[PDB]
Amino acid sequence: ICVNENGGCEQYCSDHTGTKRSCRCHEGYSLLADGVSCTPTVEYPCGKIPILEKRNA
Amino acid sequence: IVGGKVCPKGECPWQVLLLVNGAQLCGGTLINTIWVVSAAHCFDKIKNWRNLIAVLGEHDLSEHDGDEQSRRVAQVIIPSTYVPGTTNHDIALLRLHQPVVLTDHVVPLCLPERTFSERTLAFVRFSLVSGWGQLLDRGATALELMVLNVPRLMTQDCLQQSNITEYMFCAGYSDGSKDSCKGDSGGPHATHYRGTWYLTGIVSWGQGCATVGHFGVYTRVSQYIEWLQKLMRSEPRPGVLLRAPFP
Ligand SMILES: CC(C)[C@@H](O)C(=O)NCc1cccc(-n2ncc(-c3cc4cnccc4[nH]3)c2O)c1
Ligand SMILES: [Ca+2]
Ligand SMILES: [Cl-]
Ligand SMILES: [Cl-]
Structure with missing residues (x-):
């Protein structure tokens, strides 16, 4: 459930009827096969700081 | 700031x-x-x-x-x-x-979904506020961009520790040391969650800046x-x- 620990989602979380949950990602991200993690799909995704992301690559 | x-x-x-x-x-x-x-x-x-x-x-x-x-x-x-x-x-x-x-x-900055922002981001304690506003109350504005880490208060706690509507939240410090100030309004209150930053507030306004006994007031973007x-x-x-x- 999305209200506890964000449903285990890195970003956005929807509840569905049942014990079902779907995570989703902002534009410029895609959801990995874990069903929870979001990875950028563009060079300048929202909410990341390029000079810090390049300091850690 | x-x-x-x-x-x-x-x-x-x-x-x-x-x-x-x-x-x-x-x-x-x-x-x-x-x-x-x-x-x-x-x-x-x-x-x-x-x-x-x-x-x-x-x-x-x-x-x-x-x-x-x-x-x-x-x-x-x-x-x-x-x-x-x-x-x-x-x-x-x-x-x-x-x-x-x-x-x-x-x-x-990512504009979050409402549910995420209400259920998750609203409980992250510290967030960053930034701007070229006054460096001090009744002081000169900054020439380089400034940033401050501020902790968010639940509104019941804000009121007790000090109108704050459901369209606002308080953050910062009541000891007069650290606040956003005139010149900063409109800037971001940005919240980090799992490697990404999100918009959770906007620097709004009130009487003075870094006034003892008072916290900063932010528009509740959610x-x-x-x-x-x-x-x-x-x-x-x-x-x-x-x-x-x-x-
Ligand atoms: C009455 C009228 C002549 C006059 O008030 C006016 O010019 N209004 C427009 C106008 C346009 C931009 C900034 C401002 N403006 N003035 C004050 C503040 C301000 C104080 C403050 C304290 N703590 C955090 C943020 C804060 N911001 C501010 O943002 C007003
Ligand atoms: Ca410049
Ligand atoms: Cl239209
Ligand atoms: Cl016009």
Whole structure:
């Protein structure tokens, strides 16, 4: 459930009827096969700081 | 910003500077290549709506380094519920005339989904506030962008520890050392969650800055996600100022 620990989602979380949950990602991200993690799909995704992301690559 | 530090160049890449006839007006936050979020009150005294400029990639106001990108403000959208000269509903959505170009120094802040913001981000204790505002109460504004980490208060705790409506939240410190200040309004209150930063507040206003006994007041962006998203899907309208129904 999305209200506890964000449903285990890195970003956005929807509840569905049942014990079902779907995570989703902002534009410029895609959801990995874990069903929870979001990875950028563009060079300048929202909410990341390029000079810090390049300091850690 | 009182009691913060210089934001290292490029570390606040969503920060906007708003100018009117070249003069500092307010801050803002880039959320897409054409859309900036700011505070409604920043526009209470505008006469010439056609001379508003947004600058992205700014850092040191004394120099041009080539990372800055300036754009004309094409539309200023304010909720119908906002009353000039007051605090409640203090938000504006600004459409740029032409997109900015995303670069290492120009990057949007993520506008979160409402549920996520209410269920998750609202419980992250510390967030960053930034701007070129006054460095002290009754003091000069900053020439380099400043940033401050502030903790958020639940509104019941704000009131006890000090109107704060459901469209606002408090954050900061009651000992007069650390606050956002005049010149910072409109800028971001940005919250980190699992490796990404999100917009959770807008620097609003009140009586003084870093006043002992008082916390900073921020517009509660989670209340406006749907309003914002709908407007971003709409066509532009002639005339810069648009009042849009809220909710
Ligand atoms: C009455 C009218 C002549 C006059 O008030 C007017 O010019 N209104 C428009 C206008 C346009 C931009 C900024 C401001 N403006 N003035 C004060 C503050 C301000 C104080 C403050 C304290 N703590 C955090 C943020 C804070 N911000 C501010 O943002 C007003
Ligand atoms: Ca500069
Ligand atoms: Cl439309
Ligand atoms: Cl006009």
